[PDB]
Design a protein around this nucleic acid. Structure first.
Ligand SMILES: [Mg+2]
Ligand SMILES: [Mg+2]
Ligand SMILES: [Zn+2]
Lengths: 227, 94, 1112, 34, 56, 57, 170, 7, 220
DNA sequence: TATAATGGGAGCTGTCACGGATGC
DNA sequence: GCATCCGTGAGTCGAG
């Protein structure tokens, strides 16, 4: 009947700003998935981030058109624009518009975007497009702060008539995996070992992500306080 | 699977020779109390107990890892038997 | 709760008494209630009449017999390890022919086992069952000759151990041959012995031209009946002097002697019906007025020739036909052994008659009862048909008594058993269940008596039908044999009826087993019920028509293995047979007449009837069965309750309110779960353990003896050398563990000391002795301890001692002590669960309740069954059972769904609709709408085409619910299962195969005497067998050292195993193997065969494996 | 109860020896001495 | 879709290219995800799941 | 085996068949000690015959 | 018949890695018993071997530390699981034992096909190879994870089946 | 009685 | 996505006949005499059988059960005979140096006797796989060398060649022609099929053969 | 240690397929 | 040259 046991030790394994592994053991029976699932849900849906929500390109009507002088189609450019990782230096800032104008033979990278105050580009070596001789690319991209994943048709934002709405990938967290393995402390054989695996884009580290995630949860627990 | 089993099988012309080598080597480790090991202090196979990581008691695990290092010589008619025995007894008493 | 029953078929007659096959048989054999002068010539009376009179001039004759009352009641016999039996006295009279002196006395022949009320026996305290045997009915058969087509064999078969089979065959050389005791001789010779003139045989057999010419031999007719007789005697007995009276003796004993040669009454009847004749006696001939007269032989020869010729009205015989196969029940078998023992007693009688003094001989001096006693005892102990009764649950006993076996004495051996006899013959219909048989080597050889089936006085299985005249079905019920059934057109039991008249233009019937569509004018008879086709077990499987036969077999067999549960419940879906089984099995206690309940106790129920008499019923409480299952009766009534006749007073084991309860009704979801239900494994909720579902009581009996030895007496005492008070804690003053104590492996049940074997202490022992200054005790600790893996609470102690009143043990035994230990077994991982449809699985995982899939209302499922077990198995009955089970869950009702007259999909759909309203409308009123998860699942199901698009969420959820599917939430996530899952109530049983009984391990232990190999079996603390095939596995792996260890270090290499153990406790690697002892045993056993086996080296020089110990 | 002439019991593989470079060198010097 | 044959071929080819250690890891992975997805797939058996075609 | 859908390599069956062909029967003894109709191992009669051929017998 | 052997009911192992089997604690305590006495002496658990054995005699006399001792004893070692009939060599396979609570042996799903084993009540025998040699043969040659492919057809004998295929297909 | 364990 | 259909198609559970018996119909049934009974069972297991139908199916069920039960023993006996005959055969050397070999046919006479038809893929695999080439083979501009262990890809290649009319038969080292005493050699045996590489010397080949033939025995 | 006594007594019957030794 | 006799085989654990 008598039950008294020690609080679990939190173990951390981190490689760069991209990836981390988080081990929590021992836990009481079942608590491995009790902690793991909500955190996974929060980590994917609710973690604050940035995304490209809209794109305008000169002489381009719709998304499925092509660009004379450029090999990639408008589709492929928008894809690369989704992989763009933008970090806002200031909390006040909500939305930005980044302009890119280039021509001649060139391979356009994310670094080529004209710098904005308190806006950092985490992946400057990301390849947006290649331009040929006579190839002309003039474009403006709409970058917003939000959470989770919003398809293009859901926000549907347009600054002008030719602006193409882009699926907004807000989540700095790319993937969350967790697994519970049986572990034993002394004669207690049903105990849980929680392991979390988090992939981010580097804008927010996995440890930062997990910390933000557990805070959101705790704050939601305070909502049962005053009826 | 045993770690690096494919390379181990790669080392011999017959898998059963790998077995004979590993076994004899492990018996050598047991007889001399792992004093004859070719593994550096940080290559030592570890077992996790309640207190902390200690030396893996298992001589076969050892023998296989040693074999993987390449620091072991195997073959037929390397040394007369009792000479090998006595020399290992000299270098590593029991 | 309400019990709703389906089906339109009204059964005209109830099931016959299910144990009658045992009871009426044995009662018929004993004739104990019949006053001696009114007894018939059947039974043990028959055996007396065959044995006596005993002649050769003294003559011992038999007047009558009597059976006394049993010296002890059944219970007392069970406890004292006695046999429930009655003393058998026989009134005999010795008559000296010359003197005329008649001495008459009643002699005591010993005891005969009495059958209990339920149709079982008590032999040495253990309950046994004599299983009915099936065999070829005696008579005259005609079978196709397998070698030569156009020719046939005529076989004359008597009862077993009743004399020789006789074959008649037309030889390629044209003459008719007779085979007796493997002797082929011309039949015409025996024909001449019977006194047949060539003229009579010519006029009789003349109608068949070619054959009778082959019958004609003039060298035989030139002889006389005497000369022919002596000729035949010289043919059957080479070297034996051909004396006339000796030849007469031999031939009489071979053919006409009723005591040596016996066709059964059935053999008599069948011979008569087949050969179209009338038999005087039960033999093939007679000795009348000094000569022999023929009975069977000539009609047999006539029929054989007629069949060979092609004459109409002559056919071969189907030996597997159930008209040609009969049953020997308890009475016949016991009577047979009685006849044998009696014959031996007679031999002894003739001995004493010749040897004893001529002036005074009483029947008491002439009769030694011992051989008879031995015969009976042998039958009830070492016979293959005498089996340890299966009491696991009441249905197990009931089913065991109804078993039929083709094996045993006078029966088949599994080698001689081919596909034909194991087949389901068409004639098994209504007689022998097509379903319930063992899966393995005994398949088709061990079968079960059908529910409505009855064995007639001749031993043939009969099934009921109903007379149909002019399309009108009467209530007249007729039991026919298969032969009689073959004569009619019999309609199916489901043929539509309005009143007593059949209304269909076309009806489905059987003619000689052949399915045929006939008009009502053609219907002679009609089945009583689908129930009659199957056994009592198979009849307990609802929706049987939806299950493949192969799994029905498994469900049937497994119901026998169901363990009585403390909380046991009747199935939510029953077949309607659940109460009759409880009643007939004598499991439950019932009210004798209409009355009022006076007293209710755990131990007792006292009832006052209309007679004003007070009748007290003791309840059997926590008694141990043969299988160790607890059999106990609980009162189901209360003080002051009025009870009518046949009312339930008390529930026995596996009975819930008079309904058979073999298991629990649990809430199942059919889905895969994380591989834990992979390959028939089953996942259960810990909630089942919490509420004590599938918990069963088991009682184990331990026994120890203290005996007189030559080294001094063993004694049962509390004084045990070298033992602390911690070990003697629970031992009473006398040394026996006290009732109520908890025992674990290693604990002493009974203290015992034994005087040490004579030994001179080794110098080590002597020095240690002097060092510690303690005298070596002359007794050692032999005490009985709790074996590994066992334990419980001690509920009983029995102590019997020499010198105690009413107690006498076997010679040399001072005292015997028994200890009964009870244990409450919760369901655990590795325990076997099964349903009635053949779905079996071992529990692989027990999840906490929060991990369980649950309904949107927060209700967790009990059991998770993998759907992958359904399609290949083809038992859909369990699915239907689940669906209906779902309905009855929310309606709170149970169902009776008779086999083949069932609940049908639409009806289950209606019930499911009502149930859905109960399951949902409640929510709608509670102020909750449709859940988001429910919406997602509805979208999914809408893509699967499960629900119609455009309907409201409620409409769609109802659409699913009618398919027996519901939305289910993962307890670990909270997200719903993507598809809707089948969920409902299923009846699942805990089988007698329990991992607690089967788990065994050994490092070292006892070894065999000669071979020095480990003993086998858990009880002996034995090692696992590594057999030829395991050896082949190791060889195939090329693992030489593992194998060599198996062959030497771990088994019979003495030095090797010792040195290995010591090496391991020391921490050294194991030493090199030596010669396995059994090889030395081989060498020495070959030497005893006068063969010299020499182990040699490469120099061909001898090597001594016995190390000089075998050489002088 | 003898070791079978197959697998690890094959004459082909069963006489095989194992030695470390340390002991091999030491023995090599024991040979080089005489 | 991945069925018995394609999975078997996958295992064999993985044996050939990557060896038995990696093939063993692969096997365990396939095991894990297989069981996992089978759990939540919504696979079950009702009486209406045996669909009698009208063509019959 | 194919009929029942059992994939099995020819090699094994070949091993067995090889053991089935293991023996020979002498038609003529030649200069040897053997007898007509004497059954022996193919390897043994071949070794014998190579010894005889080498001997010139 | 052999020593250092046992048997029990089998139960599915889905959490087990291919080279592992669940082995009930008590079975292991008995099978490895001499090793366990030795390891009990190597620690303060018992004064000597005989004391350790007398301690393991009664079930109530044994304590927590002996189980950890047993855990150290079996480390790296394998046991041979076997299911009758043994039709081909894969009727016996080697596994690293993982001590489990309960009386049932846990078998890995992927090897079931090769043993022709299922969860309907099948039982299996355990055997402990004693020598360094036997153990080496068991781990190198007989390890479950080292035989993927059929010795007969050359096709994989350890492959997805049942629920695994079901989910992946799904 | 054998096969896959009905009895 | 029907459960029965998915389970069947995937290879998880069920074949077409069982699914058929569940949905369409139970089918033709057998009399005890072994002859097929005229009228079939028109009911599936969903609709449920009539008593008479059930009983008619019972004969077949029993026949199959007895078939199994009595099959196990004969299979076992066969296996023991095979093991006893092959047990001494082990791989005792790398090469016996034999020049002898066998030729595996890629084609077989058609049942109509008209011509030669390509053998089934599985048959050719079972005869060519992991074998050592006894002689050089040049097909489709590819050189498969003498002494080469044929991989599965090599086999498929040879089959393509056969379809292209380049090769009708493959010369191969075989236990049949091996001259190794008391066993076989490495080259004549070829692959250890379990390891998909050449067999190790010391492998007990006879036991593996006997078990490989014996194990399926109860499926016959 | 003495009347005279003088050749026994159960079989067990529904497999099968082979191989090898005798008999027309 | 071919019928017929006799002898000898006929699965593995488990428990009993
Ligand atoms: Mg847990
Ligand atoms: Mg099974
Ligand atoms: Zn070769």
């Amino acid at each position: 009947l008598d039950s008294k046991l020690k609080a679990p030790v939190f173990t951390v394994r981190t490689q760069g700003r991209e990836y981390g592994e988080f081990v929590l053991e021992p836990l009481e029976r079942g608590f491995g998935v009790t902690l793991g699932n909500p955190l996974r849900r929060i980590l994917l849906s609710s973690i604050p981030g940035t995304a490209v929500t809209s794109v305008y390109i000169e002489d381009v009507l719709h998304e499925f058109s092509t660009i004379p002088g450029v090999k990639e189609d408008v589709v492929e450019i928008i894809l690369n624009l989704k992989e763009l990782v933008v970090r806002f230096l200031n909390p006040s800032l909500q939305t930005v518009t980044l302009l890119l104008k280039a021509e001649g033979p060139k391979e356009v990278k994310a670094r080529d975007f004209l710098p904005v105050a308190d806006v950092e580009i985490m992946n400057p070596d990301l390849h947006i497009a290649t331009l040929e001789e006579g190839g002309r690319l003039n474009m403006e991209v709409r970058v917003d702060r939000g959470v989770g994943y919003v398809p293009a048709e859901k926000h549907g934002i347009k600054d002008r008539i030719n602006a193409i709405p882009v699926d907004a990938v807000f989540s700095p967290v790319r993937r969350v995996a967790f697994q519970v393995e049986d572990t034993r402390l002394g004669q207690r054989t049903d105990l849980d070992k929680l392991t979390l695996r988090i992939w981010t884009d580097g804008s927010v580290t996995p440890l930062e992500a997990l910390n933000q995630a557990v805070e959101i949860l705790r704050e939601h627990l305070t909502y049962f306080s005053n009826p | 699977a045993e770690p690096g089993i494919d390379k181990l099988f790669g080392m011999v012309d017959s898998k059963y020779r790998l077995t004979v080598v590993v076994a004899k080597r492990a018996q050598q480790l047991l007889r001399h109390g792992f004093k004859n090991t070719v593994l550096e202090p940080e290559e030592r196979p570890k077992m996790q107990t309640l207190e902390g990581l200690f030396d893996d008691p298992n001589a076969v695990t050892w023998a296989m890892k040693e074999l993987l290092t390449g620091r072991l010589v195997f073959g037929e008619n390397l040394v007369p038997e009792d000479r090998l025995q006595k020399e290992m007894e000299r270098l590593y008493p029991v | 709760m309400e019990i709703k029953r389906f089906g339109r078929i009204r059964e005209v007659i109830p099931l016959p008494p299910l144990t009658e096959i045992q009871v009426e048989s044995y009662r018929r054999a004993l004739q104990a209630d019949v006053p001696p002068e009114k007894r018939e010539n059947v039974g043990i009376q028959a055996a007396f009449r065959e044995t006596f009179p005993i002649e050769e001039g003294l003559v011992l004759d038999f007047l009558e017999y009597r059976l006394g009352e049993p010296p002890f009641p059944q219970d007392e016999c069970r406890e004292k390890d006695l046999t429930y039996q009655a003393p058998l006295y026989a009134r005999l009279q010795l008559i000296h022919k010359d003197t005329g002196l008649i001495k008459e006395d009643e002699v005591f022949l010993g005891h005969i086992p009495l059958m209990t009320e339920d149709g079982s026996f008590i032999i040495n305290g253990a309950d046994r069952v004599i299983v009915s045997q099936i065999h070829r009915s005696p008579g005259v058969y005609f079978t196709p000759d397998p070698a030569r087509p156009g020719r046939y064999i005529a076989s004359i078969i008597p009862l077993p151990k009743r004399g020789p089979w006789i074959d008649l065959e037309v030889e390629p050389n044209g003459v008719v041959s007779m085979k007796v005791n493997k002797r082929k001789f011309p039949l015409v010779l025996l024909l001449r012995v019977l006194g047949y003139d060539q003229e009579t045989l010519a006029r009789e057999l003349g109608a068949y031209g070619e054959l009778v010419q082959g019958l004609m031999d003039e060298s035989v007719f030139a002889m006389r009946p005497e000369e022919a007789l002596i000729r035949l005697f010289t043919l059957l007995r080479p070297g034996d002097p051909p004396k006339r009276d000796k030849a007469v003796a031999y031939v009489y004993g071979l053919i006409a002697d009723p005591r040596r040669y016996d066709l059964g009454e059935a053999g008599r009847y069948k011979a008569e019906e087949k050969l179209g004749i009338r038999l005087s006696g039960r033999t093939l001939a007679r000795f009348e007025d000094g000569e022999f007269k023929d009975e069977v032989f000539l009609p047999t020869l006539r029929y054989l020739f007629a069949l060979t010729a092609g004459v109409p009205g002559h056919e071969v015989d189907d030996i597997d036909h159930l008209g040609n196969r009969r049953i020997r029940t308890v009475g016949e078998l016991m009577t047979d052994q009685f006849r044998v023992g009696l014959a031996r007693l007679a031999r002894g009688v003739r001995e004493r008659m010749l040897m004893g003094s001529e002036d005074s001989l009483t029947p008491a001096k002439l009769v030694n009862s011992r051989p008879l006693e031995a015969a009976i005892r042998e039958f009830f102990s070492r016979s293959q048909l005498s089996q340890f009764k299966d009491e696991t649950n009441p249905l197990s006993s009931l089913r065991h008594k109804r078993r039929i076996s083709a094996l045993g004495p006078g029966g088949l051996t599994r080698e001689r058993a081919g596909f034909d006899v194991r087949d389901v013959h068409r004639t098994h219909y209504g007689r022998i269940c097509p379903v319930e048989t063992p899966e393995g080597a005994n398949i088709g050889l061990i079968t079960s008596l059908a529910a409505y089936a009855r064995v007639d006085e001749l031993g043939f299985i009969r099934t009921p039908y109903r007379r149909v005249v002019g399309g009108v079905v009467t209530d007249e019920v007729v039991y026919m044999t298969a032969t009689e059934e073959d004569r009619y057109t019999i309609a199916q039991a489901n043929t539509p009826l309005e009143g007593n008249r059949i209304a269909a233009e076309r009806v489905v019937a059987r003619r000689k087993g052949e399915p045929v569509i006939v008009s009502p004018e053609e219907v002679e008879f009609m089945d009583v019920s689908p129930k009659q086709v199957f056994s009592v077990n198979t009849n307990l499987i609802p929706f049987l028509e939806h299950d493949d036969a192969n799994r029905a077999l498994m469900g049937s067999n497994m119901q026998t293995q169901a363990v009585p549960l403390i909380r046991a419940q009747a199935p939510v879906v029953m077949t309607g047979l659940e109460e009759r089984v409880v009643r007939d099995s004598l499991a439950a206690l019932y009210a004798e007449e209409d009355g009022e309940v006076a007293k209710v106790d755990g131990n007792r129920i006292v009832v006052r009837y209309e007679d004003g008499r007070l009748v007290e019923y003791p309840l059997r409480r926590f008694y141990r069965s043969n299988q160790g299952t607890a059999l106990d009766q609980r009162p189901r009534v209360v003080v002051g309750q009025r009870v009518r006749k046949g009312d339930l007073l008390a529930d026995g084991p596996a009975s819930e309110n008079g309904f058979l309860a073999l298991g629990q009704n649990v809430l199942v979801a059919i889905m895969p779960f994380d591989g834990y239900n992979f390959e028939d494994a089953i996942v259960i909720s810990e909630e089942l353990l919490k509420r004590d579902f599938y918990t069963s009581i088991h009682i184990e009996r331990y026994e120890i003896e203290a005996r007189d030895t030559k080294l001094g007496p063993e004694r049962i005492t509390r004084d045990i050398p070298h033992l602390s008070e911690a070990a003697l804690r629970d031992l009473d003053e006398e040394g026996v563990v006290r009732i109520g104590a908890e025992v674990k492996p290693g604990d002493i049940l009974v203290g015992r000391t034994s005087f040490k074997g004579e030994s001179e202490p080794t110098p080590e022992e002597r020095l240690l002795r002097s060092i510690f200054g303690e005298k070596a005790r002359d007794v050692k600790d032999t005490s009985l301890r709790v074996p590994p893996g066992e334990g419980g609470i001690v509920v009983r102690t029995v102590r019997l001692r020499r010198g105690d009143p009413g107690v006498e043990l076997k010679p040399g035994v001072r005292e015997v002590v028994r200890v009964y230990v009870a244990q409450k077994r919760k369901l655990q991982v590795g325990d076997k669960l099964a349903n009635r449809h053949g779905n079996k699985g071992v529990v692989a995982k027990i999840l906490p309740v929060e991990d369980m899939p649950h309904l949107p209302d927060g209700t967790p499922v009990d059991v998770i069954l993998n759907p992958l077990g359904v399609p290949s198995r083809m038992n859909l009955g369990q699915i239907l059972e689940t669906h209906l089970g779902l309905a009855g869950y929310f309606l709170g009702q149970r169902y009776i769904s008779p086999i083949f007259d069932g609940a049908k999909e639409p009806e289950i759909k209606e019930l499911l609709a009502q149930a859905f309203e109960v399951y949902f409308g409640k929510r709608k009123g509670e102020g909750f709408g449709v859940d988001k998860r429910e919406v997602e699942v509805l979208r999914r199901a809408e893509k699967l085409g499960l629900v119609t698009p455009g309907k409201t969420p409620e409409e769609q959820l109802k659409e699913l619910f009618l398919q027996g599917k519901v939305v289910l939430y993962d307890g670990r996530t909270g997200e719903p299962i993507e598809g809707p899952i089948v969920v409902g109530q299923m009846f699942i049983m805990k089988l007698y195969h329990m991992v607690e009984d089967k788990m065994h391990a050994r490092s070292t232990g006892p070894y065999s005497l000669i071979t020095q190999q480990p003993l086998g079996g858990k009880a002996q603390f034995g090692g696992q067998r590594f057999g030829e095939m395991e050896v082949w596995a190791l060889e195939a792996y090329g693992a030489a050292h593992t194998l060599q260890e198996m062959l030497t270090l771990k088994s019979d290499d003495i030095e090797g195993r010792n040195a290995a153990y010591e090496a391991i406790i020391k921490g050294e690697d194991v030493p090199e193997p030596s010669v396995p002892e059994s090889f030395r045993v081989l060498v020495k056993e070959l030497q005893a065969l006068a063969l010299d086996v020499q182990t040699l080296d490469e120099k061909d020089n001898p090597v001594d494996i016995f190390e000089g110990l075998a050489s002088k | 109860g003898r070791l079978i002439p197959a697998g690890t019991g094959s004459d082909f593989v069963r006489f095989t020896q194992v030695v470390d470079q340390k002991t091999l060198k030491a023995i090599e010097e024991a040979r080089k001495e005489a | 879709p991945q069925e018995k044959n394609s999975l078997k071929d996958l295992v064999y080819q993985a044996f050939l290219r990557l060896g038995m250690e990696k093939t063993a890891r692969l096997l365990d992975a396939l095991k894990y995800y297989g069981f996992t997805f089978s759990t939540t797939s919504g696979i079950t058996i009702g009486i209406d799941d045996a669909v009698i075609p009208e063509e019959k | 085996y194919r009929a029942q859908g059992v994939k099995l390599h020819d090699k094994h069956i070949e091993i067995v068949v090889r053991q089935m062909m293991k023996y020979v029967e002498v038609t003529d003894p030649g200069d040897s000690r053997l007898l007509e109709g004497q059954v022996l191992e193919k390897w043994d009669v071949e070794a014998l015959n190579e010894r005889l051929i080498a001997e010139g017998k | 018949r052999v020593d250092y052997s046992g048997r029990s009911v089998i139960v599915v192992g889905p959490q087990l890695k291919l080279h592992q089997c669940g082995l009930p604690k008590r079975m292991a305590l008995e099978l490895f018993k001499p090793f366990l006495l030795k390891k009990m002496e190597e620690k303060g658990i018992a004064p000597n071997v005989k004391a350790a054995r007398r301690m393991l005699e009664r079930q109530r006399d044994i304590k927590d530390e002996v189980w950890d001792a047993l855990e150290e004893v079996i480390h790296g070692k394998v046991v041979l699981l076997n299911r009758a009939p043994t039709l081909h060599r894969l009727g016996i396979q080697a596994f690293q034992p993982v001590l489990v609570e309960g009386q049932s042996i846990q078998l890995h799903p992927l090897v079931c096909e090769a043993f022709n084993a299922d969860f309907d009540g099948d039982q299996m025998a355990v055997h402990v190879p004693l020598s360094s040699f036997a153990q080496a043969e068991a781990r190198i040659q007989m390890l479950s994870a080292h035989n993927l492919l059929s010795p007969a057809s050359g096709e994989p004998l350890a492959k997805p089946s049942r629920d695994i295929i079901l989910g992946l297909y799904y | 009685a054998x096969x896959x364990x009905x009895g | 996505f029907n459960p029965l259909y998915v389970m069947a198609q995937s290879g998880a559970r069920g074949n077409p006949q069982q699914i058929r018996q569940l949905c369409g119909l139970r089918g033709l049934m057998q009399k005890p005499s072994g002859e097929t009974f005229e009228v079939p069972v028109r009911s599936s297991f969903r609709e449920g059988l009539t008593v008479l139908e059930y009983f008619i199916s019972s004969h077949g069920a029993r026949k199959g059960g007895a078939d199994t039960a009595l099959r196990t023993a004969d299979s076992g006996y066969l296996t023991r005979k095979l093991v006893d005959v092959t047990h001494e055969i082990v791989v005792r050397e790398a090469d016996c140096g034999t020049t002898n070999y066998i030729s595996v046919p890629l084609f077989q006479p058609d049942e109509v006797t008209r011509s030669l038809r390509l053998r089934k893929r599985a048959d050719i695999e079972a005869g060519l796989y992991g074998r050592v080439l006894a002689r050089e083979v040049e097909v489709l501009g590819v050189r498969l060398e003498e002494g080469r262990y044929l991989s599965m890809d090599d086999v498929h290649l040879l089959i393509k060649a056969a379809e292209a009319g380049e090769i009708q038969e493959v010369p191969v080292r075989s236990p049949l022609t091996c001259q190794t005493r008391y066993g076989v050699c490495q080259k004549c045996y070829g692959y250890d099929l379990s390891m998909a590489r050449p067999v190790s010397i010391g492998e007990a080949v006879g036991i593996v053969a006997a078990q490989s033939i014996g194990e399926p025995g109860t499926q016959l």
